[PDB]
């Protein structure tokens, strides 16, 4: 996040693995009624009770 | 669910939705399902209505 590199940064954020490697995923798909998808993203990129988060690094550093 | 007995005019609205239509026939038509639509209006002793509201 600090040094540009948008492609790998995007891949790490939206990382979904189906199979025996479920625990090392970041985006979990959930119940899908009709054409409506409901995704669950993980939040290690929030400044709430997290000093030196991804948002601050993108914004300032 | 139809052969034993049900209502084919069960309106579904009380307002995560995409407005498929408050009637079951509209739901079966909006989603690409020819078999369900074909089964309706023909087989049930009390079939659906193609001009429902």
């Amino acid at each position: 996040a600090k040094e540009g590199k948008i492609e790998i940064f995007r891949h790490i954020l939206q990382r979904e693995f189906s199979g025996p490697y479920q625990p090392l995923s970041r985006k979990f798909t959930e119940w899908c009624y009709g054409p409506v998808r409901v995704s669950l993203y993980d939040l290690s990129s929030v400044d709430s009770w997290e000093k030196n988060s991804v948002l601050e690094i993108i914004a300032f550093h | 669910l139809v052969e034993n007995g049900a209502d084919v005019h069960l309106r579904a609205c009380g307002r995560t939705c995409f407005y498929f239509g408050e009637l079951p026939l509209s739901l079966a038509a909006c989603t690409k399902q020819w078999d369900v639509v074909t089964y309706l209006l023909e087989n049930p002793h009390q079939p659906a209505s193609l001009e429902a509201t």
Side-chain angles (χ1 to χ4, degrees), chain B residues 25-52:
Chain B
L25 174 57
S26 181
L27 171 56
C30 291
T31 55
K32 192 175 182 61
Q33 301 177 223
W34 279 110
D35 46 0
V36 181
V37 183
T38 306
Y39 174 82
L40 298 169
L41 309 170
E42 300 178 351
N43 293 85
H45 50 278
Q46 39 180 9
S49 62
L50 198 50
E51 57 180 7

Side-chain angles (χ1 to χ4, degrees), chain B residues 1-2 5-13 20-28 40-42 44-53:
Chain B
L1 291 175
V2 169
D7 186 65
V8 298
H9 296 344
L10 290 179
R11 207 160 303 182
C13 178
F20 55 94
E22 301 176 359
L23 270 295
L25 174 57
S26 181
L27 171 56
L40 298 169
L41 309 170
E42 300 178 351
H45 50 278
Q46 39 180 9
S49 62
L50 198 50
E51 57 180 7
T53 172

Side-chain angles (χ1 to χ4, degrees), chain A residues 31 33-36 38, chain B residues 16-18 20 27 31:
Chain A
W31 58 267
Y33 175 81
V36 176
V38 175
Chain B
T16 174
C17 63
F18 66 109
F20 55 94
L27 171 56
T31 55

